[PDB]
Amino acid sequence: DEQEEASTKLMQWLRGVGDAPPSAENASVSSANELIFYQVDGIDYAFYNTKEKAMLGYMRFKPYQKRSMKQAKVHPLKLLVQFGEFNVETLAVGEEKEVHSVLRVGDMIEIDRGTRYSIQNAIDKVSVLMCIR
Amino acid sequence: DEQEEASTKLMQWLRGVGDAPPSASVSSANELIFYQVDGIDYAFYNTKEKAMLGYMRFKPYQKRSMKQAKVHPLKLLVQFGEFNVETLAVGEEKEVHSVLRVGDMIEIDRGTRYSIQNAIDKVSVLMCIRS
């Protein structure tokens, strides 16, 4: 019950219905309290404050919001759905046909070096994505 | 006049005067933010290996007691002011005393224990170069 309430308050915070992130010593440790959301180019981003910057974070998407295709520049990417549903289009460094993927909660897609990808919220609710570089 | 004015306002900024900074692999001086750590002001350039090149700003007669060059050898070059540096070798018990003025440099090998004290009643600035 206690863990269920802590889990839900983190999810609601990631989904944007909260006044403060789950509040929490060791620098190796990046607690949930470091998930401050910044709106950049119309999309909400929250990253853990870690030794290498911006390696693990969350993307909060508004209803049906899409992020135009971008390229995986210096680091490979993994996108794992924290909440909601996403439509992902992937285009490798070659071929003209783009691959289309539907990801619901718990699904993960691997985006390799150089691949161009786009993300769209597939539903009329806030959807949350975890980005792993 | 332009180059001499830009050099002067960089020095004053590093010394904590002015309030205004000097407006990929390039880390420019206007991007130098000073952070207070353990009571001493540090500003580092953005490098691939973090915190390899920076500035140490000392308050009047402020001292940082001895620490050891653990994982990286370092060079201390005086950007402004006067410093007293004490050095301690691995097994040596007697510390050697050095006075460094602007432009002076001391090399601290790995494992050497060293201390730094601002020698004057003004802000003194040190450049730390780790390898």
Binding site: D41, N49, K53 | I33, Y35, D38, N46
Partner: peptide, 24 residues
């Protein structure tokens, strides 16, 4: 609420306030 260069600085400041004491 922020620009991409602005997020870079905000992440940069937050990174330094936490990890600088381990590089001195």
């Amino acid at each position: 609420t922020l620009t991409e260069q602005g997020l870079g600085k905000i992440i940069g400041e937050r990174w330094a306030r936490k990890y600088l004491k381990y590089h001195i």
